Write a protein that binds this DNA or RNA. Structure first.
Length: 226
DNA sequence: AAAAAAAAAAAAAAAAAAAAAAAAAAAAAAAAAAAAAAAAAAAAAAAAAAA
DNA sequence: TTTTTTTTTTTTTTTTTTTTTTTTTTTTTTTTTTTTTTTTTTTTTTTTTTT
């Protein structure tokens, strides 16, 4: 039906607003993102619900609550990583595209603040690694949907690319950061040539030391940058 | 004796028209939510008048 | 100069109306069947005409 859908989603919104730290939050987010493309009215309501639940300007005070929301989003994505990313990406298309006009640009500021604050969290991380790779993966998705949001920090992302370990999650770091570089390098405003030099050098160094899929997904980036 | 060609009514046959019916879809109505607009009211500000 | 009084603007609340959405019900044009009538065509005998 179309009634029942609206009613159950209303109940879910009240649940996720009122008494957080309930266990089943993540799954609720997974199901609601699963239903983003089904209809029209449902689409409008989920769009406005997600615009008020996460992507709000979040003024620069009480940063701990903001970090807790960040924890929420990272948990959601890291749990839905198994099935697929298509619904999330479609949702992101909807939220970004749906405001092409000036219209005070409410979301652009907030999203850029989410990515830079995640960068900063990554910075102070310094050394749970599942959460690290999940955050980098979230960075990857946010780059894929729109590349302008992650233009400034790629040179700061370079040191992770240089050396890493022989564990799976680390390999996921290597492939995802290569993917990000592939996505962002052509749009980077006036890069430095030595930066490209060391990029290409360690890319070859990575090729000569690791498995199949990582070699594939990095020589891809090599072809793109060349 | 012979013979050919043309008409007229009656008979068939296929296409179109006229009842008869069945089913999808447009319409209407009710409820109820969500929104929008208008009226009013409360507070803030800026000017004007007197001591 | 300062104190006291007036007026305009801004913003929030509320109430009535409007819009929306679904759902259920209804009644209508649409679609198919059957018939069946008409009209055209056909035939065959009759009539007309020719040798």
């Amino acid at each position: 039906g179309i009634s029942v859908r609206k009613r159950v989603i209303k109940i879910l919104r009240d649940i996720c607003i009122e008494q957080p730290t309930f266990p089943k939050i993540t799954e609720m987010c997974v199901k609601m993102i699963r239903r983003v493309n089904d209809e029209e009215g449902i689409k409008k309501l989920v769009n406005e619900t997600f615009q008020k639940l996460w992507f709000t300007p979040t003024p620069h005070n009480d940063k701990e609550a903001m970090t807790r929301k960040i924890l929420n989003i990272t948990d959601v994505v890291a749990a839905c990583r198994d099935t697929g990313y298509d619904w999330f990406e479609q949702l992101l298309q909807n939220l970004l595209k749906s405001e092409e006009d000036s219209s005070y640009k409410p979301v652009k500021k907030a999203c850029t603040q989410l990515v830079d604050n995640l960068v900063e969290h990554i910075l102070k991380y310094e050394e749970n690694s599942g959460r690290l790779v999940a955050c980098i993966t979230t960075l990857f998705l946010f780059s894929k949907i729109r590349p302008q949001l992650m233009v400034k920090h790629a040179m700061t992302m370079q040191p992770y690319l240089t050396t890493k370990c022989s564990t799976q999650n680390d390999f996921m770091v290597i492939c995802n950061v290569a993917k990000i570089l592939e996505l962002v390098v052509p749009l980077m405003e006036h890069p430095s040539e030595t930066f490209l030099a060391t990029i290409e050098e360690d890319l070859m160094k990575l090729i000569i030391k690791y498995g199949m899929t990582v070699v594939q997904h990095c020589v891809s980036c090599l072809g793109a940058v060349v």
